[PDB]
């Protein structure tokens with residue numbers, strides 16, 4: 001999941 | 010462990026334009042820099058901030074699209090599959 005990878009604040 | 014990727018040359022140029030340095034990145038860094046790219050080139054719609062209008066940007070060339078919604082990012086997946094090596 002690229003959305004998840006990006007949003008790991 | 011850490012899946013480092015080397016962006017193909019056109020994509021590398023986008024990432025550099027967003028402040029990236031070097032040519033090896035995590036996929037997470039790639040996504041970070043692609044977001045930044047869109048922000049600083051103002052390719053998003055200020056009224057509908059999920060919509061990106063990339064057509065006539067190099068990014069739109071890579072994606073093969075005039076536009077995309079972050080809400081439906083299949084194009085981004087397709088593009089990164091093709092333009093990140095190892």
Ligand SMILES: COc1ccc(C2=N[C@@H](c3ccc(Cl)cc3)[C@@H](c3ccc(Cl)cc3)N2C(=O)N2CCNC(=O)C2)c(OC(C)C)c1
Nearest residue numbers: 002003006040043044045047048053058059061079082085
């Ligand atoms: C309501 O408005 C939003 C909601 C979500 C996003 C977004 N969503 C994130 C996201 C989206 C899809 C994937 Cl597959 C991964 C990450 C990430 C992102 C990463 C890469 C690209 Cl090419 C575009 C956006 N991403 C962002 O980059 N955002 C969010 C937080 N910080 C920002 O500067 C912009 C968004 O991004 C603009 C750049 C279009 C706008």
